[PDB]
Specification:
By secondary structure, this protein is α/β, with parallel strands linked by helices. 24% of the residues lie in helices and 18% in strands. 39% of the residues are buried.
């Protein structure tokens, strides 16, 4: 497949964050991380998994799971720790659902499903 590389979840740089994540055409779940982050290492098996599910199945035209490296790229966003997760719904990108990470796929489903406007579940 042309797009079958490791990264179902759209790794968005700070360059694209305002276009991709801050897009209201779809609900975008963003994860601010660092590659050296042990917390991110616990966020990755959910992110690329759920992200796969979303960006591979019926949601790949809908909610996009995305993530930006908050320490490689200088984000104009707000960090409420070192990493942060923020759901920018397609309708309430002005009041994202700020999170630090539940470390689970379950919560992610529930996340864009309750927090998302599309209710992606």
């Amino acid at each position: 497949g042309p797009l079958g590389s490791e990264g179902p979840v759209t790794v968005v740089v700070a360059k694209n964050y305002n276009e991709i994540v801050l897009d209201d055409t779809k609900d975008v779940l963003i994860e601010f991380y660092a590659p050296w982050c042990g917390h991110c290492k616990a966020l990755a098996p959910k992110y690329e998994e759920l992200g796969a599910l979303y960006a591979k199945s019926e949601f790949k035209d809908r909610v996009v799971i995305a993530k930006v490296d908050a320490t490689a790229n200088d984000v104009p966003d707000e960090i409420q720790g070192f990493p942060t997760i923020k759901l920018y719904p397609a309708g309430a990108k002005g009041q994202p659902v700020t999170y630090s990470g539940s470390r689970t796929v379950e919560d992610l489903i529930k996340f864009i499903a309750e927090n998302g406007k599309y209710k992606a579940a």
